[PDB]
Design a protein around this nucleic acid. Structure first.
Ligand code: NA
Ligand code: NA
Ligand SMILES: [Zn+2]
Ligand SMILES: [Zn+2]
Ligand SMILES: [Zn+2]
Ligand SMILES: [Zn+2]
Lengths: 162, 162
DNA sequence: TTGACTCTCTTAAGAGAGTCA
DNA sequence: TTGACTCTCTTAAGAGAGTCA
């Protein structure tokens, strides 16, 4: 198995490569009607992506390194967290985009949490709109708002009470 | 079936049957430290479920009626909304449990909205904690809270900015 | 050892349809 | 006609692994 020193070297090589990804400035809602700026380090749309990187799905990538003749491969956003626990409360930890930008690999835009916690950030009001996440959101979730409900609760007769 | 009269008759028979489901009182967080009470009309755990109802998955059911000598069948929570548009902004409309209780078939606890709006209610602070849903939530979402994030955003070197 | 492709799987909110009796 | 089972699919946040040169 890899030593913790070998893992750190993988993280370091990953950071050096992602650091050369195009850095894109995005203006984003923070909640409370305020706007902020995030700087995303975006993997390219098509090959080549960068040393060690390959696309396994439309918006999925993996990072691969060969150490002492053994090929090791990780989800491309999981590498910052290789020295962290991989589960919590019986749930698998997942890479969670605080910037909600899947191509971004900026580790300052990622956290490591259950898939439920991950998903829920899509609807968060944001760091200036009432976010209660202990690891605070960087922006208002893209799906926050009143929604677009087509039909509300209703009955034709009188069989029901709320 | 095809005619509006036939659809109204389906809705009316569905309501009469669901109206005979056991009524279970559930005390629920509303947000803001307040508590409320909902009356869920719960489909039984095992057969028989009620006239027209059958279980197609651990927590999935369907409602079936014979009209024009043919069998018509729907997801068991979709029946209240058979006269509504079945899509919005090009997204499929789905039955959304405001009570977050899958066995409940109380139409006063259901709305009809995109799967994204549906999911997002799991994290809503609730009607007394800041819900902004235009069709208002009945309770705080079961997954609302600080989360259990294992690791936050971090870098080893100096390649990244937020 | 490396790049650029290929394939299927997980989760938890939701669906459609077939086989029998 | 009605009941009680069986199966796979959709979505959008996420994953693991094989083949070839
Ligand atoms: Na996410
Ligand atoms: Na729901
Ligand atoms: Zn980013
Ligand atoms: Zn948040
Ligand atoms: Zn209910
Ligand atoms: Zn709400």
């Amino acid at each position: 198995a890899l030593t913790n020193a070998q893992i750190l070297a993988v993280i370091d090589s990953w950071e050096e490569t992602v650091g050369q990804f195009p850095v894109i400035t995005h203006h984003v809602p923070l909640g409370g009607g305020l706007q902020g700026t995030l700087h995303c380090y975006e993997i390219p749309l098509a090959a080549p992506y960068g040393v060690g990187f390959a696309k396994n799905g439309p918006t999925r990538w993996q990072y691969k390194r060969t150490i002492n003749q053994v090929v090791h491969r990780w989800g491309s956003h999981t590498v910052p967290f290789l020295l962290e626990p991989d589960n919590i409360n019986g749930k698998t930890c997942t890479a969670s985009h605080l910037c909600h930008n899947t191509r971004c690999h900026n580790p300052l835009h990622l956290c490591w949490e259950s898939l439920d916690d991950n998903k829920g950030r899509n609807w968060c009001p944001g760091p200036n709109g009432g976010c209660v996440h202990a690891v605070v959101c960087l922006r208002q979730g893209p799906l926050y708002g009143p929604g677009a409900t087509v039909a509300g609760p209703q009955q034709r007769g009188s069989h029901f009470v709320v």
